[PDB]
Chains A and B, each alone.
Chain A
Amino acid sequence: NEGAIRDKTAGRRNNRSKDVTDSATTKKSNTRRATDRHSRTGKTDTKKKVNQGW
């Protein structure tokens, strides 16, 4: 507690003087999309394998 009050670089008028980063308003990033149907698992079960099961 002793350090907390006296320490400058701390407060509200402190932070309110600095500039808000651009990543604040970065919107979405979309992640992975429109790649959804293309299988990263990269297997493709086989004609004989899918007829033996079903």
Chain B
Amino acid sequence: SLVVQEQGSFQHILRLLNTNVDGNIKIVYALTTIKGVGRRYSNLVCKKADVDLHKRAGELTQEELERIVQIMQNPTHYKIPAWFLNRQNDITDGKDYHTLANNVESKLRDDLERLKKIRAHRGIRHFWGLRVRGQHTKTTGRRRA
């Protein structure tokens, strides 16, 4: 298309949401490295942040990046549909959350631990390192842990 230049102000390896992110790649795919961030959520948000998807995560004035941040923990305020999110309706407060980065591992625990402390057949199934989804365990699951 059109060759660009900028300066040394292109920066590789930027850290955000307590995770290091690769520059020098299309910014849409640099944000998926962050936990809870997939290819759809990185698409919709990068759009909703009014960021050039042709541009790499390298330059990305920090004002832009801080915009990109804000929407990821503020989905319903920037009008991302509410079907677009992983944690909906919760189990307690009843609200809808997109849990991201180190917080997805965090909240993942609680879900299991709930089921575990509840003495649920699926928590039983989880304590035993087994298949929770009801599939046949006979043949599959061999080389295992």
Contact = CB atoms under 8 A, between A and B. Distances in A.
Q: Do chains A and B touch in the complex (CB under 8 A)?
A: yes
B129 A5 contact: no
A6 B124 CA distance: 9
B128 A11 contact: yes
Contacts of B120: 1
B145 interface: yes
Contact of A5 (B127, B130, B144, B145): B127
Contacts, number: 25
Nearest to B129: A12
A13 B128 CA distance: 8
A12 B116 CA distance: 16
Interface string A1-14: 11011000011110
Interface residues of B, number: 12
Contact of B129 (A1, A2, A4, A13): A13
B124 A12 contact: no
B145 A16 contact: yes
Contacts of A4: 119, 124
B119 A12 contact: no
B58 interface: no
B20 to A, nearest CB: 33
Interface of A: 1-2, 4-5, 10-13, 16
